[PDB]
Design a protein around this nucleic acid. Sequence first.
RNA 1: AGCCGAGUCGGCCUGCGCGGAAGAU
RNA 2: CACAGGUGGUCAGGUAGAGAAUACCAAGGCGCUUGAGAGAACUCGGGUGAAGGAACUAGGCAAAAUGGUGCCGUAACUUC
RNA 3: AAUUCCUUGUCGGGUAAGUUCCGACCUGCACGAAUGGCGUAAUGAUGGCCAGGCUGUCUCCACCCGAGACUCAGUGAAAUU
RNA 4: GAUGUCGGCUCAUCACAUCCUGGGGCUGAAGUAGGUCCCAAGGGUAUGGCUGUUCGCCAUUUAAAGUGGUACGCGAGCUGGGUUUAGAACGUCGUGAGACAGUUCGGUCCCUAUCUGCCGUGGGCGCUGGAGAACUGAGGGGGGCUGCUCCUAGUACGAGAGGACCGGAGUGGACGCAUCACUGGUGUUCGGGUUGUCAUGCCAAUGGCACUGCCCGGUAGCUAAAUGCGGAAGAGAUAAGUGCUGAAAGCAUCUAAGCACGAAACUUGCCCCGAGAUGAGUUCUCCCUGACCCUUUAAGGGUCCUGAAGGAACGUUGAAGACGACGACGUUGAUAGGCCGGGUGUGUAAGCGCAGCGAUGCGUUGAGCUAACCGGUACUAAUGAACCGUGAGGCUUAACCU
Lengths: 208, 123, 55, 114, 118
Amino acid sequence: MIGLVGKKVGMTRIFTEDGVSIPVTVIEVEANRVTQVKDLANDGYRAIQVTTGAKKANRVTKPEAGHFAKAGVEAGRGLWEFRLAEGEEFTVGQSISVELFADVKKVDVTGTSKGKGFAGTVKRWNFRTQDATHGNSLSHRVPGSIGQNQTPGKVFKGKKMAGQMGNERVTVQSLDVVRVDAERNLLLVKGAVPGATGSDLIVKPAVK
Amino acid sequence: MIQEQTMLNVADNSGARRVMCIKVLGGSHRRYAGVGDIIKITIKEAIPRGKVKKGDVLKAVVVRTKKGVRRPDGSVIRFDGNACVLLNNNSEQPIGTRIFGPVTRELRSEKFMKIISLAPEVL
Amino acid sequence: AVQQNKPTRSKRGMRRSHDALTAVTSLSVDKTSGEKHLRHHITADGYYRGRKVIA
Amino acid sequence: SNIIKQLEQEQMKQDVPSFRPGDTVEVKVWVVEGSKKRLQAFEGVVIAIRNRGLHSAFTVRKISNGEGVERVFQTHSPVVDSISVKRRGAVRKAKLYYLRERTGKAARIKERLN
Amino acid sequence: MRHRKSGRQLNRNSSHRQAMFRNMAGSLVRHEIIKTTLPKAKELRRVVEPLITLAKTDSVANRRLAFARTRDNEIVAKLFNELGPRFASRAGGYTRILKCGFRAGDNAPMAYIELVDR
RNA sequence: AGCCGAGUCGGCCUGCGCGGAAGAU
RNA sequence: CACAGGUGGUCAGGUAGAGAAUACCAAGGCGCUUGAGAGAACUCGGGUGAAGGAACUAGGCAAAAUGGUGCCGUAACUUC
RNA sequence: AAUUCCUUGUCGGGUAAGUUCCGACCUGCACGAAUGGCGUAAUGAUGGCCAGGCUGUCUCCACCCGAGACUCAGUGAAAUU
RNA sequence: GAUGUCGGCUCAUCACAUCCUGGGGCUGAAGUAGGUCCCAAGGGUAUGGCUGUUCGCCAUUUAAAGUGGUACGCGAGCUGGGUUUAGAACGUCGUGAGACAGUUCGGUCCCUAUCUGCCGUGGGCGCUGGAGAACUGAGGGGGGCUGCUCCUAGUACGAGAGGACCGGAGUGGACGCAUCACUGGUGUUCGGGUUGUCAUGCCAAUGGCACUGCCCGGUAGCUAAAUGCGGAAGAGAUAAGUGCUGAAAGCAUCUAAGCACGAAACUUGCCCCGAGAUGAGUUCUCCCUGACCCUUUAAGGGUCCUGAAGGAACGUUGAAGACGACGACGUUGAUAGGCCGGGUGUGUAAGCGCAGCGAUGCGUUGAGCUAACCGGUACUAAUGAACCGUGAGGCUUAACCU
Ligand SMILES: *C(=O)[C@H](CCSC)NC=O
């Protein structure tokens, strides 16, 4: 099935009457507006495109404005796409709300992780440190050996080394749906999700 | 959080005073033991005319720790020391006839009901 | 660690292919005195955006 | 965040009495053993308080059957049934960790009587 | 990482930083316009403006606090007798920064900073 | 051979093939 | 070499202190002849650490620890 | 044994487990009496072994304060080929 | 006219003659548990005592603690216990200088990376008028482990003692990714206690130096010991193996013609990169509709007029970052600082009054101060402009409109 686009608000807890505390992530999901329908005859596959949010007039270029005006919807802050299954139909200009998850039980959430910058092997790959005493000489966190002798005479492809860590696309699977609130546009899920407060999230029904 | 070389006090009247942990049973490469887990020990100090001697090798279960236990609402319970109860190597049943100090409800299983029933308080 | 062969002038130039300087795109003109200045900076006589600031 | 503040304030108790570090308190908690439910009591001195809205907590220390015990309670949990103040104490600090190294007469606390 | 942190190190230690900003606050109050480096000027607002906010209510306690933070009785007197009344009805933003060129000895970027009613 | 009607048995010499056949960038 | 090295004699203020030790000052003398920003891996010199406490290692290497005055009290052995 | 190849000799002590350590046995490959033999209180930046206290030595690393590394302006080397 | 030699640490990659988990034939295979041979390389595969040890013996674990190659892998990556310089001693050999794959105590480990290789990150041009976005998927990488309890059932099997296959449900070890609501660490930018000495004329009140002087607590951020999630199920073609129908060879035969099953290995299903895929792909939107001259006459050169869509530069900056890059904003404005109200932390300020001979106590008072947090607010700084980018976009053939 299709999914929705939302924003990360924060984390809190829910108390039950038995005396259990459930940690929850709070996701705000406003209405998603359909901008384009793609079919087999003209594009080669079946999908929909959606927008959400709001944008200021003097930041919208003429190409984008014309694209929005063809569909007849107000400008939003981005464009995303979802693939269709057999038997699903939508029309241009339609609005989809968070009531779509009323009976779903588990979801998958996709986002962009926090950025650590240039990282070493100890933090990036969980390497072990060498001795801090007993005569070590300037080699406490360094990586160690990286190959063999004359045979093969090179370094293999895919070796683990220091570099940039984080700031990439990540998916977390099979989270329980804890609450759906349609009057305040809220979805509450159990556990932690990638990203920082205020970033964008993509939510779909669980694939497994 | 009990590992190898850790010293513990004894919460029963079987004769031992101080014991040392020599293995954490379970699976391969296992690090820690907590309340409710079974370990292998050696005896380092005992009173004169008890039921055990200094240097024996037996089993034991952990009943109190300085790190504590969490509960399903987020609460904690912590103690001031580390204590255990001595078990028989083959049967795995207690060796003494009395229990000293409080214990917790993690022990409420079919295996340790004698300890639960002999304890003076269950928190 | 040192070289085994002497590098060539062609290689010297290829490495230096990233060393050129960039000039300022344009200057600004004050609305009262008519002087030229760096944008968002004051002029050499003491004007900024039409007003005299430093005497 | 207004959204999270709204979600949080509809779960808070409004019956909590006022207490301070150095006081003696009694706390009643629920215990389930099979199909029965009952209340069990825990009484002791208050050494630390954490004021964090719905996430508030406090810590209590007592000596039981020759052993020292400490419990950290989450203030707004339905496991806690009631809290009562039995004595008022007089100290200077906000945290009373130095009491972990004292016993007997050396651990006494003065009464406030304001 | 330095996520969400505030403050500038300036290749010094804390005692040196504190002493330097004390002296610079004194100089700005005394002369009403000075010339320095751009990052230093940007740091100086957060030291000087709170003193002017403090000087809007005259009492022995407030004068003693200002003395603790400046250590100059002339500066304290000027604050409380002149600069509080002048700014009595202004909500923040008592200073102003104007960028100038580059220093001849080391090519550092420079700026003037001044009070807004000089 | 199995339960009626033309072939069937096994030794020899010789051409080409099949199994015996597990290693490290 | 405008070099973190070597080079005999004389003078001896205040408060603490056994003191020419050590801390803070007086008379007096200096900030050591490239600077300005930023706040990554790694290297150098330091501060703090849940639970465990030599399980490290050729080896407790290195770190951590003890530390003043007055009084009570102090074993085998001994050339006393 | 600062001496013993066979050898981690055999027996006792200390550890859950001791090729090192301490006490004995004598089958001294190849001890031995001023190129001295056997003991010995005190002394040692001397070799070996065990305990109490103590800890980032370690399970297993986390955060912070400073000096470089990085960017701009001025000066401006070396081995090797 | 020099290729550093044992063992340990750090980090690995390949083979299969397979240690564990997976699938099978025979058994002197009743069951449980074993013996032997065939297929299979996806993942996994101990901590300590002694010794310089690799080995080995011993203690206690585990589903299991595989065997080999890679300069007996790895010192321009670390150590320096052993071997192999100069000091000294024992036993033994020699008249002696000395000597011993015999022993014993002590004994300097250098190098700023040009080229290949590998991990990350930019600038240029190309893709045939220019520009802003959303995609398809040729191809490439990551991942793939397993214990114990309960039901089926005290059933099948067995004289007894013992005790299942097949199929379901729960709870753990080790490993990987993300995150900061809870439990905690740090927090020389927040508050307080206190020792010595110097100063602000002095009392009272404060500041500088002594490792942040020495300490006791702690906000935001970062973070593990904290808490969420993962390994699959399904599908196709098979290995060893098991079969149906059926002649050559009137019988028999899994095979020669035809047909059916069958494993963590193979191809997919799950996650990430991906059109410099030069074989440079597809969809949606936006912009440009003026005059002349010359010559060797053509994808030619030049002069006036015109300067779009968009981009870049500059400034205020970020939970983005070595520098480039990436994201937000520039008066038609909440981008940063300040300012107003809350929250959090510390723990009852100064001044004054009262009790006391005094050190101190009590009242005003849960007082004063309060970083990086939450909600608001144009007080200060984000200037009109200038700059780059053009003027309807080649030839040939086919099919439809005229
Ligand atoms: C032999 O004794 C050894 C040979 C070295 S050859 C590089 N040398 C010892 O000093």
